[model samples]
Target chain A: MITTGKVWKFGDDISTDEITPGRYNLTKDPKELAKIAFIEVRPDFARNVRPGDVVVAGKNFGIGSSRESAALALKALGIAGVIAESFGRIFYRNAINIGIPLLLGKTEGLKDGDLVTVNWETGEVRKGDEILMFEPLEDFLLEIVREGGILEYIRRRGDLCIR
Target chain B: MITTGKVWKFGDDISTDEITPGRYNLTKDPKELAKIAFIEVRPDFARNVRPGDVVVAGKNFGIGSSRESAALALKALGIAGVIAESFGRIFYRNAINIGIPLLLGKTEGLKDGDLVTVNWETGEVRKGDEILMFEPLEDFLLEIVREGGILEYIRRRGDLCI
Candidate 1:
């Protein structure tokens, strides 16, 4: 799959709490949660985020909390993908389980609103004439993403054994 | 708080998939989930687990995925607490967030069916009159557990600032 989006850049250690605050844990609805994404830390995020926007960040993005809403909110907001230097372990799994594509790579020249295109199959990211490559999701995980997340993946297979 | 239970011992890297299989991830209800806890990896767990039981394990227990159901299943099974040499980072937060008490300690002599008593406030574990001490949860996290999980904590605080 290929994803084209506008970049929304963030710095290191952008925690889940900042992505979706703890107070919103009351509701499990992703759409309801998306309205407050980055409410406190990046107050303008929800207001300005457009569909097909991608988050680009420094190391440790989505650190802290097993709150799946962090990834859910981003997915609900129509984020096409995330590119970060590194990601929090659980957050990485959560995003994949929910079918949000992620790319692990440097984001030095990427800036807010830059038009970026990523090819999931090849791990190629293009910004104008500048092209960068990063490791893509492994086959099994990509299969889950293609099936629209793990729930559907399991539904199709009728079992939990992903091996 | 104090808790007394029979230990159900396990080894290292017990992933969330083992705790609660992914196929059952469809439901968010903890009670429904308790029925299948460790269904695949430890087939006898759910059938034999008694209330007030505790899980004692080696390093890196709950080491895969961010599925909160893994913690919820144990909580629903009436597990009193868990003591591990180390825990998966996300599982540690999930267990504490949901008011499941945990202790980080060595499990050298702990065995299945061993009667254990834990003092959550003091981080003390007593097994057959032999006592071992472990580090307790820090104040803020302990506060979350004390308040019966982060949801209630946020409900009381009326904001997401936590």
Candidate 2:
């Protein structure tokens, strides 16, 4: 779909617990989840981020939580996608499994509010004249995202079909 | 009196972002802040526990933030407390601040050779001990664990007082 969004900056080791608050975990409502989505991490990220904004950060993004609620909070809080130097491995899979697009790109000296465009296809990140490079994903990994996450892809494949 | 150590646990939600995740607002070490600690709230506590142990979890124990880590992970871990629950709320804080002497009750769920202990107040968790209860605190809120966690407690006293 090549959908687009704005860019925001964050440092490294971003964890999922900060993605959504535990107290809010008390509820399953996506809206309520949105209210406190990033309350701990940035406080205003959940309440202020535009519907199609993207977050770029340091390493270990989405480091905590094995639950989809963490990614759901990111997607629900209007994070179009996330770009980090690297993910916590499992979080990367979980984000893709749930349809939350997260690409990896190193962020060394970036400032806040740097309007950047991310290319999900070629795996490129650009801000004005700046071009940042990150380790690209494999074709299989890219296809998983293209199919709109692993669960959806699984749904399309079916459980037992021997035809 | 001061205590120091990392928390040890099984899996799932044994941690939280506010306590152990990325750099959002402040740069304080997640292990240092007791407020946002272990707020992930998954469940499966007392399942794989041992007597005195300190450790860390992968992700989302206190996934969401409520400033309860003061009562949860930081305080628990820093004091060398035990962690049995994997992820989720309602379990983290109740053990540490509430003075659960023998926290990590029924830790028989854990596998063999797993090393952990409870240095929070004073004492440790045992294996297969159902109904774990906290003992009396030799020093209430020993170290920085008291006063609603490290951050607020530090701020309240000024000069990084604990």
Maximum-TM-score candidate: 1
Fnat by candidate, in order: 0.00, 0.00
In model 1, residue pairs whose N, Cα or C atoms come closer than 3 Å (at least 3 residues apart or on different chains), thus clashing, are none
> What is candidate 1's CAPRI-style docking category based on DockQ?
incorrect
Regions of model 2 farther than 4 Å from truth = A1-3, A23-28, A160-163, B1-162
Query: What is the lDDT of every predicted structure here?
Result: 0.83, 0.53
lDDT of 2 by residue, A19-115 (tens): 7766455465767777777687787677667545677788888787665677777767667677888898777877787677666766774566544
**How many pairs collide in each candidate, listed in order?**
0, 60
Best-performing candidate as measured by lDDT: 1
Residue-wise C-alpha lDDT for candidate 1, range B1-162, written one tens digit per residue: 777656789999999999998888788688889999999878877855656668999999998889899899998998887889999999999999888888898887788756567887778987645788987788788788879899998898788664
lDDT of 1: 0.83
User: Ten consecutive residues with minimal summed lDDT in candidate 1 chain A?
Assistant: A121-130
| lDDT by residue for model 1 (A1-163), tens | 8765568899999998899985478477987888998888888888777656689899999999898888888888888778899999999999999998888888887987665667876778776546788778888888988898999899888887656
Ignoring the other chain, what TM-score does chain B have in each prediction?
Answer: 0.93, 0.27
